[PDB]
């Protein structure tokens, strides 16, 4: 398998395996045979079950240990029953001995006679018999032993036969390793197992291209070549996600903002990522995101114009009401701003801004409802209002069609006083009066009303004259007599304050109407 590394394979030594047999003749003998795999192979066999005392050695070549410290030996063999060998009473055996010795000398020519160290006595589980030969049943044993901790460049293996009848079908020698692997986005190298069969080897991992360490990546290598329970991890950098044991760049149309984010997601509504490995999505044409933001959250737009603009008015006060636009963009942060102006026959947009101490209750700006009440403004002028539908964007794309206008003509109230009333001509019986238009008509002046009486409280009669013009002639008065005059104006809202008293005394100048 992937966790075993071969140091010796008898079947695989295609350049013929050269082993020392001692004795060189009459002991272990190499002999040709057909295996479990039907391959023709040379193997060693011995069957001297009829001699009193037997000591037959067979020793491998020098076997370099590489770096291993715990080496396994897997022997496949057949051993025959001493029952099935006729008249072998006393000496026949059913076991063989297994040895090794360590050496840096790869050319030790002669089997050591002392220095060998017994690994084990190997017995069979399926000793064979005449019948098996008869029927071509190959009762094949497998035994594994292991040795170490090994310290020298190499070792030899040996087999001693003391009287069995046995055939070595294969010898394979190997060590174990935990294979190169990636766990929690860290890479761990091929790692040779430790010195004992209970040894763990600590291995520090390396963060995969391209990812960042969260906790230090570590894993343990088990004696059996299985990686044991890991600790630590790496996280895929922003714009990358974990697939297999790699951090791959996010696909086109996908993005990942931080390393701490799970996988790539697709770009939310009205954003797009044109490159792989995208940490953000570039908003689509005409779309934006507010300072209060998440790149996760979809991009939005300035709304349409607000709808059903609906005006109410009192004499010198405008109350306004409208409805949510057709397209919000959309978002819940929609608000409205009110804008005041002043025009007339100046259709061209020639409108001084009216800026004043008006209100505008509750707000005038950043308004959450669909109502606003304007107060403290002048009576007979055409005001214009723009209501603007706003949101968290549109500061990034303003435009007059995010608003709708109402040109409105105000209400009228009763006028100011006149202040200047003059006597134009005085005769013995008449007073001709003339006055100016009040400073603030507060509307269309319909007529004027003159109130007069004698200055003296005794014999005083209050009289009234009406006119459309700003002048009148009071006739039929007492000569050389002092009178008082007041003038007021009228609009549909009512009467203005009477003017400051004008005192005029008739003279003795003859009336030309009277003549003679």
């Amino acid at each position: 398998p992937a966790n075993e590394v071969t140091l010796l394979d008898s079947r695989s030594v295609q350049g013929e395996l050269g082993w020392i047999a001692s004795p060189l003749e009459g002991g272990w003998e190499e002999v040709s045979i057909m295996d479990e795999k039907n391959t023709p192979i040379r193997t060693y066999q011995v069957c001297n079950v009829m001699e009193p005392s037997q000591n037959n050695w067979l020793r491998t070549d020098w076997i370099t240990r590489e770096g291993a410290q715990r080496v396994y030996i897997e022997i496949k063999f057949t051993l025959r029953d001493c029952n099935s060998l006729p008249g072998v009473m006393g000496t026949c055996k059913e076991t063989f001995n297994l040895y090794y010795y360590e050496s840096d000398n790869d050319k030790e020519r002669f089997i050591r006679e002392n220095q060998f160290v017994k690994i084990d006595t190997i017995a069979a589980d399926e000793s064979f018999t005449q019948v098996d030969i008869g029927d071509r049943i190959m009762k094949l044993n497998t035994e594994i032993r292991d040795v170490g901790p090994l310290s020298k460049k190499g070792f030899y293996l040996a087999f001693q036969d003391v009287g069995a009848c046995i055939a070595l079908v294969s010898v394979r020698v190997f060590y174990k390793k935990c294979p190169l692997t990636v766990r929690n986005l860290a890479q761990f190298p091929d790692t040779i197992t430790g010195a004992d069969t209970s040894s763990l080897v600590e291995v520090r991992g390396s963060c995969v291209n391209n990812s960042e360490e969260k906790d230090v990546p570590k894993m343990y290598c088990g004696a059996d070549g299985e990686w044991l329970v890991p600790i630590g991890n790496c996280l895929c950098n922003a714009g990358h996600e974990e697939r297999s044991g790699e951090c791959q760049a996010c696909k086109i149309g996908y993005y990942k903002a931080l390393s701490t984010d799970a996988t790539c997601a697709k770009c939310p509504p009205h954003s797009y990522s044109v490159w792989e490995g995208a940490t953000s999505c570039t908003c689509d044409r005409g779309f934006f995101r507010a300072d209060n933001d998440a790149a996760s959250m979809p991009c939005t737009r300035p709304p349409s114009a607000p709808l059903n603009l609906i005006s109410n008015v009192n004499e010198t006060s405008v109350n306004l009401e409208w409805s949510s636009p057709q397209n919000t963009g959309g978002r819940q942060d929609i608000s409205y701003n009110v804008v005041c102006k002043k025009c007339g026959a100046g259709d061209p947009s020639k409108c001084r801004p009216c800026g004043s101490g008006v209100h505008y209750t509750p707000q005038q700006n950043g308004l959450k409802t669909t109502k606003v009440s304007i107060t403290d403004l002048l009576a007979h002028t055409n005001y214009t209002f723009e209501i603007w539908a706003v949101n968290g964007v549109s500061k990034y794309n303003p435009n007059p069609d995010q608003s709708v206008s109402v040109t409105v003509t105000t209400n009228q109230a009763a006028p100011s006083s006149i202040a200047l009333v003059q006597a134009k001509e005085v005769t013995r019986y008449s007073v001709a009066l003339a006055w100016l238009e009040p400073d603030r008509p507060n509307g269309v002046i319909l007529e004027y009303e003159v109130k007069y009486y004698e200055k003296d409280q005794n014999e005083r009669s209050y009289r009234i004259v009406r006119t459309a013009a700003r002048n009148t002639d009071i006739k039929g008065l007492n000569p050389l007599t002092s009178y008082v005059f007041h003038v007021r104006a009228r609009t549909a809202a009512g009467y203005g304050d009477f003017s400051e008293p004008l005192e005029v005394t008739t003279n003795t100048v003859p009336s030309r109407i009277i003549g003679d």
Binding site: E29, S32, C47, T78, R80, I133, I137
Partner: protein, 141 residues
């Protein structure tokens, strides 16, 4: 070197006269070896300008007709003409008892037969072949 036992060597190619009248035969004793060598060439030789065959151990009837089918057992593959160190070698011990389960046994005074088919695969009425007579114990001891 030491021996009690003899080893018969046999070079199996068609260049070898002992094969000519199809009557190559050896007398062996028990525990003798027969070593058949395969045909083996120079590195600079095309592997098809090359003799290669499969060796089969078969009974008399299949010794007669050059036929392994239903006659005996495959034993060796001579297909590796550039074998790394020397020619490919098949060893046979003429033993009483096999230590191998699917090995082979021989009795004195009995006689045993080998034939071969080529890797050219040609259906032959003609094959290189060998008869082995295992002597009586009273010609050995």
């Amino acid at each position: 070197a030491a021996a009690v036992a003899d080893r018969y060597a046999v070079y199996w190619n068609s260049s070898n006269p002992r094969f000519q009248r199809g009557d190559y035969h050896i007398d062996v004793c028990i525990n003798d070896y027969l070593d058949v060598f395969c045909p083996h060439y120079e590195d600079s030789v095309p592997e098809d300008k090359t003799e290669r065959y499969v060796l089969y151990m078969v009974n008399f009837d299949g010794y007669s007709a050059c036929d392994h089918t239903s006659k005996g057992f495959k034993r060796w593959e001579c297909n590796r003409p550039h074998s790394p160190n020397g020619p490919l070698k098949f060893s046979e011990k003429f033993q009483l008892f096999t230590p191998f389960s699917l090995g082979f046994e021989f009795r004195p005074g009995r006689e045993y037969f080998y034939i071969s088919s080529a890797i050219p695969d040609n259906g032959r009425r003609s094959c290189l072949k060998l008869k082995v007579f295992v002597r009586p114990t009273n010609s050995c001891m």
